[PDB]
Amino acid sequence: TIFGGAFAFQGFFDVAVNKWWEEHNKAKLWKNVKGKFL
Amino acid sequence: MPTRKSNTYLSLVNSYLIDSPQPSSINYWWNLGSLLGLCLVIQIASGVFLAMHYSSNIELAFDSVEHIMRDVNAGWLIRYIHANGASFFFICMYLHI
Amino acid sequence: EPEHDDRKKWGLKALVVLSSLYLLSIWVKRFKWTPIKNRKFRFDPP
Amino acid sequence: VQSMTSVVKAANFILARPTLSKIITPLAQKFTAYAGYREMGLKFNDLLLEETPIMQTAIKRLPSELNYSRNFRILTAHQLALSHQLLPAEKAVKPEEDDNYLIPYILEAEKEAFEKAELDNI
Amino acid sequence: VQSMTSVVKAANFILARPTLSKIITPLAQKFTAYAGYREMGLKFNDLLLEETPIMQTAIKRLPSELNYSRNFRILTAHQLALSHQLLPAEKAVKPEEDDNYLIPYILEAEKEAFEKAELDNI
Amino acid sequence: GVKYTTLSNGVTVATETNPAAKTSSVGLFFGAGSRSEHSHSNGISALTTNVLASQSAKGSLLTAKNDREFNGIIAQTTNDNITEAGKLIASIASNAVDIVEKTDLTKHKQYLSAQASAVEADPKSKVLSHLYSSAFQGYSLALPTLGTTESVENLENQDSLRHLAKHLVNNNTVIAASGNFDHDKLADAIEANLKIAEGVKPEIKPASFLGSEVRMRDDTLPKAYISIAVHGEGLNSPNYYLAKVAAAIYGDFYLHSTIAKFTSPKLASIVQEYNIVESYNHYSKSFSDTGIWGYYAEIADKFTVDDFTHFSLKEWNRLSISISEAEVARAKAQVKTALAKELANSFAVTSDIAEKVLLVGHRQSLREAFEKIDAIKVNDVKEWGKSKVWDRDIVISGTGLIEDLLDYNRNRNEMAM
Numbered sequence: 001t002i003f004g005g006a007f008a009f010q011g012f013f014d015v016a017v018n019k020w021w022e023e024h025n026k027a028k029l030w031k032n033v034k035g036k037f038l
Numbered sequence: 039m040p041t042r043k044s045n046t047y048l049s050l051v052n053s054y055l056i057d058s059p060q061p062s063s064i065n066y067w068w069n070l071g072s073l074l075g076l077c078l079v080i081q082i083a084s085g086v087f088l089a090m091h092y093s094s095n096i097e098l099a100f101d102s103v104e105h106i107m108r109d110v111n112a113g114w115l116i117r118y119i120h121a122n123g124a125s126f127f128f129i130c131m132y133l134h135i
Numbered sequence: 136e137p138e139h140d141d142r143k144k145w146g147l148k149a150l151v152v153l154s155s156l157y158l159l160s161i162w163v164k165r166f167k168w169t170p171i172k173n174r175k176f177r178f179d180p181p
Numbered sequence: 182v183q184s185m186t187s188v189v190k191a192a193n194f195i196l197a198r199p200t201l202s203k204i205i206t207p208l209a210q211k212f213t214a215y216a217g218y219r220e221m222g223l224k225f226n227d228l229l230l231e232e233t234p235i236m237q238t239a240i241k242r243l244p245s246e247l248n249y250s251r252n253f254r255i256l257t258a259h260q261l262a263l264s265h266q267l268l269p270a271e272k273a274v275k276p277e278e279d280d281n282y283l284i285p286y287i288l289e290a291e292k293e294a295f296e297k298a299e300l301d302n303i
Numbered sequence: 304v305q306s307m308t309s310v311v312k313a314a315n316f317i318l319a320r321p322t323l324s325k326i327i328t329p330l331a332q333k334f335t336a337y338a339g340y341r342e343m344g345l346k347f348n349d350l351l352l353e354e355t356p357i358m359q360t361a362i363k364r365l366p367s368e369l370n371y372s373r374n375f376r377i378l379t380a381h382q383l384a385l386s387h388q389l390l391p392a393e394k395a396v397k398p399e400e401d402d403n404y405l406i407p408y409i410l411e412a413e414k415e416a417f418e419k420a421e422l423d424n425i
Numbered sequence: 426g427v428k429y430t431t432l433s434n435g436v437t438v439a440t441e442t443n444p445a446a447k448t449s450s451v452g453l454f455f456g457a458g459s460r461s462e463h464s465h466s467n468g469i470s471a472l473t474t475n476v477l478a479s480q481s482a483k484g485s486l487l488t489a490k491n492d493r494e495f496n497g498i499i500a501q502t503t504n505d506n507i508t509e510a511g512k513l514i515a516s517i518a519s520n521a522v523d524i525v526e527k528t529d530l531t532k533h534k535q536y537l538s539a540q541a542s543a544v545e546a547d548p549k550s551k552v553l554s555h556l557y558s559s560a561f562q563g564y565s566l567a568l569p570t571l572g573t574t575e576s577v578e579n580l581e582n583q584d585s586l587r588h589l590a591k592h593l594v595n596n597n598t599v600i601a602a603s604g605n606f607d608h609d610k611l612a613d614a615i616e617a618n619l620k621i622a623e624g625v626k627p628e629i630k631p632a633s634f635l636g637s638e639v640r641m642r643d644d645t646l647p648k649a650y651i652s653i654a655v656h657g658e659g660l661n662s663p664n665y666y667l668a669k670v671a672a673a674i675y676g677d678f679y680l681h682s683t684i685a686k687f688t689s690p691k692l693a694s695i696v697q698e699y700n701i702v703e704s705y706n707h708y709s710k711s712f713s714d715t716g717i718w719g720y721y722a723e724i725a726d727k728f729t730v731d732d733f734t735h736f737s738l739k740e741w742n743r744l745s746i747s748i749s750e751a752e753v754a755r756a757k758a759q760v761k762t763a764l765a766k767e768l769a770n771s772f773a774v775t776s777d778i779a780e781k782v783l784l785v786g787h788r789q790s791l792r793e794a795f796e797k798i799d800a801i802k803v804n805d806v807k808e809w810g811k812s813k814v815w816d817r818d819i820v821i822s823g824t825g826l827i828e829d830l831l832d833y834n835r836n837r838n839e840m841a842m
């Protein structure tokens with residue numbers, strides 16, 4: 001019963017943090033840099 | 039009698055954590071004790087999750103630690119939790135004393 | 136420190152969650168202690 | 182730990198000589214004022230370590246009115262420490278109310294204990 | 304576990320019919336004799352599991368003389384078990400002495416408990 | 426014969442005339458209790474009523490009725506002497522100011538102060554009296570009905586004379602009666618003898634419930650006395666009888682009574698597993714617009730106060746869940762009998778009819794009350810329980826051996842699960 005809210009909070013915080021982290025570190029990630037070294 | 043006082047295990051848990059009559063005037067310095075307990079617990083937990091991947095052999099010890107850091111999922115997290123939790127355990131113990 | 140990226144990201148998640156828990160615990164403690172914080176006494180012997 | 186009898190004996194040892202009383206008594210008064218217990222509504226005797234058979238016996242023999250006043254003072258001090266607030270100078274325990282009310286009973290209990298020890302040791 | 308009322312009801316269910324009584328009663332007597340409790344100074348009622356609120360109530364409701372006799376029988380049985388020795392047939396509890404003295408009290412307690420449960424369940 | 430009569434002036438004469446009444450009583454009431462006082466003049470309503478009730482009676486029994494809301498003098502006499510009693514109180518009331526002006530209050534103040542102290546001595550009245558105040562701290566309803574020793578000692582004839590002139594007015598006064606007598610003869614007798622000054626009905630001073638705990642830990646007493654209650658429905662509330670029904674579900678208990686082991690309420694069976702409580706009493710006290718619903722309990726063991734509060738409050742939770750039809754049927758019947766019992770004595774009904782006529786303006790006979798209670802289903806009780814009990818703020822009072830009574834948070838948390 002409790003697991004529902006816990007999972008909701010986990011998913012919400014995970015998605016928000018991931019989006020913010022990727023946006024803030026954008027230029028420094030491998031995914032965005034690979035194209036230059038292709 | 040409430041079930042928390044009749045059952046022996048719940049009776050003990052009650053006597054120690056539920057109706058334990060603490061003085062009303064105790065400030066936050068009296069919460070270090072429980073903190074230390076938590077520290078011990080986490081250490082033990084981390085320690086166990088390190089024993090599952092650590093090798094006691096001298097030639098394999100350090101290499102096994104690096105295996106934990108680099109290859110084991112969350113191995114770095116548990117290793118650092120254990121190492122820094124030793125220091126934090128002693129910080130809590132020094133403030134305790 | 137190959138885990139550096141993931142280490143700092145997990146640290147961010149942990150800080151967010153623990154800070155939320157800490158603020159909630161402060162609120163709940165000041166809450167539970169209002170009856171004792173606001174407690175008064177009177178002492179009226181003959 | 183130190184017997185109340187011993188500290189009273191030392192205090193009388195000093196007070197009997199103005200040469201040392203005139204020097205220490207002002208210092209003692211300033212120390213007690215700065216000790217900070219008065220602002221919490223406590224008297225010196227309230228601070229004494231109760232958890233000692235001699236101290237428990239002395240408390241049990243305390244008159245009803247003094248015992249109730251002491252209980253109220255202790256409760257007020259606990260409430261103040263809990264609320265992290267102090268009585269103003271108006272409500273604080275003035276120096277003259279530190280009457281050392283509990284010392285006579287503690288000394289009686291100490292004398293009884295010392296007499297017992299001295300008598301059974303022969 | 305089984306309510307004494309239920310076992311008494313079953314026993315009366317059987318005993319009301321000689322067709323089954325004439326067959327089982329001899330077997331029951333032989334089985335009680337072979338049970339081995341009589342040779343230790345115990346009656347059937349002494350074996351009953353006391354640690355039950357109904358049973359504790361029934362014992363507390365027992366007359367003084369019966370209670371003392373039961374205490375002596377239990378003590379004698381414990382001593383015999385401890386000494387690994389048994390009473391001879393002369394000193395053993397005769398079959399006619401198994402009077403089921405405690406059954407009425409247990410049945411009264413069971414009736415009270417069942418009445419409580421029935422009344423509060425409506 | 427509940428019929429009402431309005432005199433040439435606005436005074437209403439309500440009489441519960443009924444044949445086969447053992448004795449008859451008449452009483453003049455004005456709606457000014459401790460509610461309509463303030464701390465400086467607290468107890469003046471009781472003092473002024475005692476002075477009036479202290480007047481010589483022509484063989485009648487003058488007694489003073491003092492209450493939070495209403496206050497008046499009641500005269501009890503044989504049915505044939507009721508008209509004399511009616512004319513008597515009109516004489517008492519018309520001459521109220523004159524009597525008080527020359528009256529020496531010193532002896533009466535001693536009697537009133539003695540009453541108030543005696544109330545404090547009795548642990549139940551202290552706990553209840555403190556309980557009512559703690560719920561309504563800051564408002565006039567918190568004042569003791571009979572006042573307090575220090576408050577009374579400052580009373581003076583001017584205080585009461587100001588009080589009577591404010592409250593003893595035609596619109597704020599009612600006349601109650603009961604017994605085997607003709608209504609018209611009593612009304613005519615009153616009209617020819619009652620002369621009182623006109624005035625507006627004083628606005629009833631507001632009061633609001635505030636959950637709080639008042640502890641008077643008294644370790645020299647042999648038993649722990651506690652009461653816990655919530656903001657129960659008061660008079661002129663549609664749930665007034667519903668609140669009483671809810672209280673009767675848990676009913677009363679006394680450990681040393683022959684009925685203890687065989688009484689219906691679930692809490693009674695629970696507490697006997699350890700002899701937790703010696704006596705407890707569930708009640709629904711109702712004022713003009715506010716009521717307090719809860720229980721009073723006396724615990725003869727230092728170590729079982731917390732156990733009782735836990736179980737009693739746990740039982741309250743069952744109002745909103747798992748309440749049985751048998752309990753509601755029992756509570757409905759028990760309240761109906763208790764309601765009828767209160768109205769047996771002619772004195773009791775005279776007080777009751779005065780209370781309703783003042784505080785609600787209309788009264789319901791037992792016929793109407795039985796029709797209302799009989800219609801209370803299990804659901805209606807459960808909705809009331811959720812509204813007024815489930816997770817609602819409690820007010821706690823306790824005087825003796827309170828050390829084991831756990832603090833407010835613990836008890837209050839038991840009100841929900």
Ligand code: HEM
Binds near residue numbers: 117
């Ligand atoms: C009070 C309890 C404990 C304390 C204070 C403690 C303290 C320490 C400290 C200071 C280190 C050094 C780590 C570093 O230098 O980075 C360490 C390493 C280690 N401890 Fe603990 N320890 C405790 C309990 C345990 C337990 C319960 C286990 C196993 C169940 C354990 C197993 C290990 C292992 C395997 C290492 C080395 C593994 C690695 O660093 O990769 N310890 N401990």
